[PDB]
Every structure is written in structure tokens, then in C-alpha cells.
Design a protein around this ligand. Structure first.
Ligand SMILES: [Ca+2]
Ligand SMILES: [Cl-]
Lengths: 180, 180, 180
């Protein structure tokens, strides 16, 4: 019967409708689940990018700081190098020379013993013609048993020479500054 | 004609059911592809989170190290600065003054030439009253053809003056430390 | 009659098919929406990995740089320490000693006052026997009303002693280098 072949067909078609309904429902379920996982992933990505951006900016600053550090090191190393070559050392045994005059406080010492002190004052400067020429300290002066003008005159000359030689020595000390 | 399109609608309904079947399967396929891709994406996020966490911890330690570094830089710069102002320079042409006494080894030199050496020993100290007053080195002494007491006496006075002036010079050297 | 609810079953089945059609269509579109979001998410993950990989390598370089910095800091700190102990200070009040000879420019000074200058030239070296022995500066010389050989001779000896004492002093300055 044509109508009987309609309902048997209807029964088969509803079984198919049931199968489809379940399948569509499952697909919809999965999609909602996938969506949730996706939303969670998107959130973690946002936070990840926030952190990485912070790190990227932070590293940039670190490198800049490292540049300054390298520059400051270069600076202090440069000065130390300069100082090392320019400074007077207390343990070096080879002669050291200054390009300037020198001034110290109480005294100068050689080999632990004092050599030059402060300028000694209270002197009246001698006057005369300084004798820088030949000076014979072993010069002998003859004195006879009777008075001779030339002998005594020779004494006078030697005395005058001696006093002018003293002046020469004194002037030397004064020009150095050892005495006033 | 109840059997009609009861059967032809069944045909139409079956056509639509087959297409529905095809579409559901296609949707299922897509979901499966999405599921695989999402799972891969989620994993990479997990590893990313791990790496970023590591980077964050390493960077924090680095910043702490940089703090110590800046402090050490400040330290050495300060010290170099102190040294720069306090040290005696060998190339400076302007007069330099020490706050201390000074002791050197063999000798002191001026302009490459030795001026003061070690204290010279072996001296016997002269005795007397040093003459620090007026001393005329150009004093002339008259000697006549006949013996005159005042003339020879003046000679004696001049000699005594000279010798006491020598003592004054000698006293200066000993007080400085140039001789023992 | 059987055919009448054959058509009614068709009507009910049509509602279900229309519902299914919309539901499948909704799933399909939703999947396409997910794909777009997922593709965007994947892209950002790729860029994240690029940045993080860069940072990992960047951090490695930095730690290495930091090691060198500490090595350089130790070096300059050591050098400053060495320089600090070995250098001559302008502000130290305690006597400072050199293990070496010293040379300066124009002069040596004590307490702001010049003591030793450049070596004075133009001297002729005195000759004779230097008197380093006993020297009495307070020695008196008798001169009588009449010529006496021993008295005048004593004068001559006193003169010779003085001149030999001058020689001793001059020798001292010359040996030091204060004079040529
Ligand atoms: Ca049907
Ligand atoms: Cl579906």
C-alpha cells in the first residue's frame, strides 16, 4: 500500500533525524568547548605579550646601562694609566725628576739623615768683593826676627783675600737660600 | 493521491537528509582540524610561559648585579679623584708643596745636576762666638815701613773677625745637616 | 487516513529539518569564526617565540658581559690600591721617604722659603790642606808695643789655619754640588 510505504519510510527518516540531532548537538558542544579553550589561550597570550614587552624594554635599558658602565670603566682605567706614569713612587730606586720646583715642610733628608733645614735667620750680610778665583790655603807667610814691611804686608793681603773668600762662601749660601 | 508526494516528499526529505549528513561530517572534520591546531597552540603557550618566567627571573638578578656595579664604579671614581688631587706629578711645571718632611736616597738635584748629597762626616766642630753682625771683606790694612802696634793689632782683630765668621758659616752647615 | 498522518508526519519532519538546517549552518559559521581567531592567535604565538628566543640569547650575552665587567672592576680596584700605597702625597704630614734620588726644576724650598737653588758656577777650586781638626774661633792674638817675631808668626799661623778652614768649608759645598 502506497500509504504504508510512507510510514515505514517515516520511521526510517526519523531514525536518521535522531542520529543527525545527536551529531549536530555533539558538534555544537565541541565548538563551544573549543571556543572556551581558545578564549583562555587568547588571555594567556595577552599576558605573555605584556611580560615579553616588559622584558624587551628592560633589556634595552640594561644594554644602555652597560654602555655607560663600559664608558665609566674606560674612563677610570684611562685615569689610572695616566696617574701610574705621572706619579712619584716611594719604592722605585731609579732617579725621579720633577718638572717643577719643590717645597716641603720642616726638612730635606738624605739616607734617613737631615741635610737641609729651614732658612737660618739673624744674619747681617757681609759686604765686599767676593773672591771666586784661585785661592791657595797652603800659602805660607814668612815672618823674620826683625820687622819687614813686605812680610807684614803679605799677611795683610792674605787676610784680605781670606775675608773676601769667606764672603764668596757666604754669598753662595745666601743665593741658595740656606741663610738670610 | 494521499500516497502522492507522501512518497515524493519522502524523496525530497531524503535528499535534504543526505545533504545534512554531508554537512555534519564536514563540520566534524573542521572541528577535528581545529582541535589539533588548538592543542599544538596551547602547548607552545605552556613552553612560552616557562621560558618567559625564566627570563624574568634572570633579568631581576641582572638588575641586582648592576646595582653592585654602579656602587663599585662610584667607589673607584671617588678614589681616583682623591688621588688626582693629592699626588705629586712629574710633568707639572707649577711649584708643588708637600705637607711632610722629605727623605731621598743618595742626593737632591736641580735641573739634572746634583746640589745636595749625603751628610759629610769626619768634622771636628769649631768652637767660639759666631760673628753674625757686620763683616767688611773689603777692609784694607795699612802696613808701614816701621813697626806700629795699632797696625798689627788691626791685623789681629781682622783675623779674629774672619775666623769667627768662618765659625758662623760652619755653624750654618752643621745646623742644616750638610756636615756632621 | 493512514495517508493523512503520513502528511502530518511530513509536516513535523519539516520543522525538524528546518531546525537542523539552521543548527548545522550555525555550527559551520561558528567554526569559521573560530578559525579566524585561532589563526590570529597562532600568528601572535609565532611573534612571541621570535621575541623570547631573541631575549634568551640576549640574556646570555649580558651575563657574559657582566663577568667581564667584574673582572675589569677587580683590575682597576687592585691598581688603585697599589697606587694609593706607593704614591707621594701633598697632604700627608708624616715624613715621606723615597727609595730613589730626586731631581726638581728651579729650586728646593722649606716652609715656602727657598733653601737650595741651581748649582752656582764660575768657581776656581781652592788648593791646599783642608783643616777638619780642632779650630778655635775665639783664639786671641797678642800684639805688643815692640815687634815680636813669635807674636807676628802666631798671626801668620792663625791666618793659614783660617784659610785652610775656608778650604774645608768650600770643599764641603763642592762635594755636595752647591758650587762647581
Ligand atoms: Ca517523511
Ligand atoms: Cl553540525
Amino acid at each position: 500500500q502506497g500509504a504504508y510505504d510512507a510510514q515505514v519510510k517515516n520511521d526510517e527518516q526519523d531514525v536518521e533525524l535522531a542520529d543527525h540531532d545527536a551529531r549536530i548537538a555533539a558538534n555544537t558542544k565541541a565548538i563551544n568547548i573549543l571556543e572556551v579553550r581558545l578564549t583562555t589561550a587568547e588571555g594567556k597570550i595577552v599576558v605573555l605579550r605584556s611580560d615579553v614587552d616588559y622584558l624587551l624594554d628592560e633589556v634595552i635599558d640594561i644594554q644602555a646601562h652597560l654602555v655607560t658602565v663600559d664608558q665609566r670603566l674606560d674612563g677610570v682605567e684611562s685615569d689610572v694609566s695616566d696617574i701610574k706614569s705621572d706619579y712619584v713612587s716611594k719604592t722605585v730606586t731609579e732617579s725621579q725628576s720633577l718638572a717643577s720646583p719643590l717645597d716641603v715642610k720642616t726638612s730635606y733628608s738624605v739616607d734617613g739623615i737631615q741635610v737641609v733645614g729651614a732658612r737660618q735667620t739673624g744674619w747681617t750680610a757681609a759686604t765686599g768683593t767676593p773672591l771666586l778665583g784661585s785661592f791657595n790655603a797652603n800659602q805660607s807667610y814668612t815672618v823674620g826676627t826683625t820687622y819687614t814691611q813686605s812680610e807684614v804686608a803679605a799677611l795683610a793681603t792674605g787676610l784680605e783675600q781670606a775675608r773676601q773668600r769667606i764672603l764668596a762662601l757666604e754669598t753662595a749660601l745666601r743665593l741658595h737660600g740656606l741663610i738670610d
